[PDB]
């Protein structure tokens, strides 16, 4: 706001909607791997 005229704003609702998004993105990302790692561990147990 000091450097250029451009106005941005953050609210406590903006923060509360971050914590939601991270929780949602972390589960999705971790669920993609926990599926991928399972295939390899399932397959290694067969190879062995």
């Amino acid at each position: 706001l000091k450097l250029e005229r451009r106005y941005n704003y953050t609210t406590p609702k903006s923060f509360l909607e971050l914590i939601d998004f991270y929780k949602k993105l972390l589960t999705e990302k971790r669920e993609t791997i926990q599926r991928q790692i399972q295939r390899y561990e399932m397959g290694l147990n067969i190879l062995a």
Partner: protein, 49 residues
């Protein structure tokens, strides 16, 4: 980038075709089976490539 994406799909396909092939084939067939010898040659090559 298209070849890196292409090869990843072919290796992912070959990976699944080891899991079904080993499990389905019997221990007496596995030793002198032709399809399993071919896959192990291809998978070793495609990893280096």
């Amino acid at each position: 980038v298209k070849k890196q994406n292409e090869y990843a799909v072919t290796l992912d396909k070959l990976e699944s075709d080891l899991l079904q092939s080993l499990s389905e084939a019997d221990p007496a067939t596995i030793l002198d089976n032709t399809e399993l010898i071919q896959n192990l040659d291809k998978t070793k090559k495609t990893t280096i490539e």
